[PDB]
């Protein structure tokens, strides 16, 4: 893919891995939970506000009749199921990443 | 519904208890080291790819460049620094289908 400085959810298991000695094989299992039930509220269609980075809110995009003029089929895009994500304020808000 | 990062970190032991593996103490700082190395990552202008769920990138409303009145130095229009969530395909097809 297109490389920038980046990081795998393998790169944070490496982080708490060398952060903490109280787990072991186990910082696969934390890592992957961390996220498996971010998902699964998500499923249930639940918001999920972590205090200090903001909420993964649920969203749907409804269906939409689309026409342009020069096609004969209309391209009526359907309803497509997605998450958004909403900003805290010390992350973004003119605050931490934002100096 | 909703759901709390206490609440997560809660779920987190109840799971992560076992015969051994973590404490109350300790589920406490996983859940928040996380969310720090992550910010602090998005700091450094690197970009968060976990599998599973997705990826967070900082965006920046572009500087352009002004020759304002100071010295031979080339002076910033301000950015607005926001991040963006893009969602993985296993998280929005598991959206997309109904449970």
Redesign the interface.
Known sequence: MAK??????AE?LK??AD??N??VQ?IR???????????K????T????????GK?K?VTTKPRTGINPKTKQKIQIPA??????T?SKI??DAV???K
Chains 1, 2 share one sequence.
């Open positions: 920038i400085k980046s990081l795998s959810a944070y982080e708490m952060e903490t109280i787990k186990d299992l934390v890592v992957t939970s961390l996220q498996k039930v971010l998902a509220e998500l499923a249930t639940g918001e999920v506000r972590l205090f200090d980075i993964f649920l497509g199921k997605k998450i958004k994500l900003v992350l973004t931490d990443s934002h």
